[PDB]
Amino acid sequence: SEPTSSSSLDITSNCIIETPLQPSDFLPKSANLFPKFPERISVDSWELWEFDTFDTNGSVAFGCSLYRDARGVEQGGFHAEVNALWPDGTHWGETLYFAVSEVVENSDGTTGGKWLSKDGGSITFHIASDYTAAALDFNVPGKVSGTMELRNHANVSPTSNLPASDAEAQLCPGVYYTFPMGPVATSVTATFSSVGANGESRELFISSGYGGMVRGWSARPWPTFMNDAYYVVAQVGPYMLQILRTLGSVFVQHKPFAVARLYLDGSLVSAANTVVGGDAVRLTKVQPDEKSQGLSGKFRDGNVGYVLEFAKKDSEHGWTFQISHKRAVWSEPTSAPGPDGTGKSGWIEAISGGAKGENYEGHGFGGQLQIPVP
Amino acid sequence: SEPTSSSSLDITSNCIIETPLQPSDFLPKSANLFPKFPERISVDSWELWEFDTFDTNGSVAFGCSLYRDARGVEQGGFHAEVNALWPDGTHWGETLYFAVSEVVENSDGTTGGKWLSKDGGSITFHIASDYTAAALDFNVPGKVSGTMELRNHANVSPTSNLPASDAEAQLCPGVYYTFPMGPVATSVTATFSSVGANGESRELFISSGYGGMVRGWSARPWPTFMNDAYYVVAQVGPYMLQILRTLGSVFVQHKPFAVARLYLDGSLVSAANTVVGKGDAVRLTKVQPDEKSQGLSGKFRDGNVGYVLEFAKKDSEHGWTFQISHKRAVWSEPTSAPGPDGTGKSGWIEAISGGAKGENYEGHGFGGQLQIPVP
């Protein structure tokens, strides 16, 4: 229907200001999908709309992160991170840059997004007014074409679970990180122009595809509140989990932060916005001298997985998940090479566990990142 | 069964000289089991008689390395390094010290050895005249008692495969390292006084176990030719493999060396005393956890999760390749002060797969790796 609010940024026309901007206020019980920096972005602001999918077996993965941030604008435009993994292990990953990013909210309550390049190429999204469906269209000449869909089938609505306060929506003060669609079934039909050593591949996720959507924003740039991060969205038996876990740089006195959600067949059973010193999470790296199964990334972080624990606020009973890195996705440096070189690594994680007495098994799609900030 | 050669050293009564000693010459087509430094050792010299065992699935392991060198003078004994692993992951491991090491050759051509301490505890070995059987008796008070047996059953005799030249017996000039018994079936019956939490425990390998025997010696001290080493003996389907590979210290210009033997159905198909840049050659490549998902790392600065071991045939493109991944941690001891570059030694129960091109046999091995902080 007709757009009732509209934010349209264009790199050729004054889209970025070199001093800070306060975002529009957080809206309780809203997915906050409309841009929080709607007229221009600041020197350091970032906004994220992310949609990740992977097959029930972990054999195929397809992720799209859509950004508006100064780093992308410095690098050539409003940017998209697009990464795909095939059953044989071939990875396709590119950062794509777009001259225009437009997001509108329509009279019916839907949200539509458009990352648009001067040659006509585009990535668009459309999100249902109650956040239970989202559809992406890729039309990027000589890179990727196709569709992605995320659909929530829960009995409890996404709206019931939406953060009601800053605290529930925040990683830390002023940093908003949210999972408004909750558990979703996914499907993908895409074609890529050039994969491996030449030749187009076609990529398919039947709607059984697990995955998840992320909406985030901040005036504060990532290096000021973190130098190490882990993110995963996963399905383990009936459990649907999603978590971002940051370890602080010196600019936040090395404090760790987390946003995490645990669903049991579609119902929210744990919501944490705190790290074990709502609920709390503990996220412990696993090293190869401790556990034999799991890949390490190619940089100075040598972990082969993590142990993730959800601890109930008003109880003792909790859930524990063993995460092992099963397949490499993306691997890029974030510093000069060397013994202390940092980087980012995507993964198709093998995950097991649950409550005491449970041993479900499934897969996740995620990644870790370090940057060389002390 | 009457002794005809006898060497008996008491590390507590002045048998160490502080300048180099030349050993007795290498004997071709002999297992050279009698000590090569029979009357005295130097601060540099070392001799090794090693006997290791593990069960066919790799759930249990028991090894014993008997040394003559000067490292233990301050503890009053020659080293006996004894390590054990149970199916539940419990590990027992000690360097035991014995003031006296006595090795004899008998008139019947058998070799007897006795590591003996002042309190009467001992470890003894007895090796057949044709090297087809070895038996060890452990009687170490409050530590370990029992027996270990290694037997060769192959068609072609141990003697037929024994090095005929110094080159075939050598890791490198002056370093002798040999596997004279070849393929062996093993059995163990042992009791350990205190394991895990102050409790006694017994350990059994039955005549159907695997393992290997090592005979080695040198006037040259280890830092002068190596600062990294890997050793394994294993069974992989019909293949029986045994290898030591060293990575050189700066004193040999960081050159790698190896002694390696590969049997197939009990016949020697590859004998390598050289590393791919004589007989065959071997390549040994470390595997990192960013390359292969399965395999433990040790606890020190070497983070490898395994190795690729290639036997390359001289004439041809036909060779054998084995993927080694560290399956179970046995022993773990530092060889330097702790820190980010701290070194150590780690024992392993290896999972190994491979064979000829296209083959994917699976079996297990027993071995270990070591670094020392020598430039």
mmCIF file of C-alpha atoms in Angstrom, chain A residues 166 170-176 217-220 225 252 255 257:
data_model
loop_
_atom_site.group_PDB
_atom_site.id
_atom_site.type_symbol
_atom_site.label_atom_id
_atom_site.label_comp_id
_atom_site.label_asym_id
_atom_site.label_seq_id
_atom_site.Cartn_x
_atom_site.Cartn_y
_atom_site.Cartn_z
ATOM 1 C CA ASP A 166 15.360 -0.275 26.367
ATOM 2 C CA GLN A 170 19.815 -3.410 24.186
ATOM 3 C CA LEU A 171 23.176 -5.099 24.051
ATOM 4 C CA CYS A 172 24.420 -2.154 26.129
ATOM 5 C CA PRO A 173 23.491 1.528 26.523
ATOM 6 C CA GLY A 174 22.595 3.000 23.147
ATOM 7 C CA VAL A 175 23.316 -0.259 21.270
ATOM 8 C CA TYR A 176 20.114 -1.908 20.099
ATOM 9 C CA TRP A 217 21.184 0.085 15.374
ATOM 10 C CA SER A 218 23.458 2.423 17.306
ATOM 11 C CA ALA A 219 25.054 5.817 17.319
ATOM 12 C CA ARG A 220 28.059 4.102 18.911
ATOM 13 C CA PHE A 225 31.997 -1.271 22.714
ATOM 14 C CA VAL A 252 34.022 -0.056 27.759
ATOM 15 C CA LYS A 255 32.892 -5.456 29.773
ATOM 16 C CA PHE A 257 27.565 -7.965 26.674
#
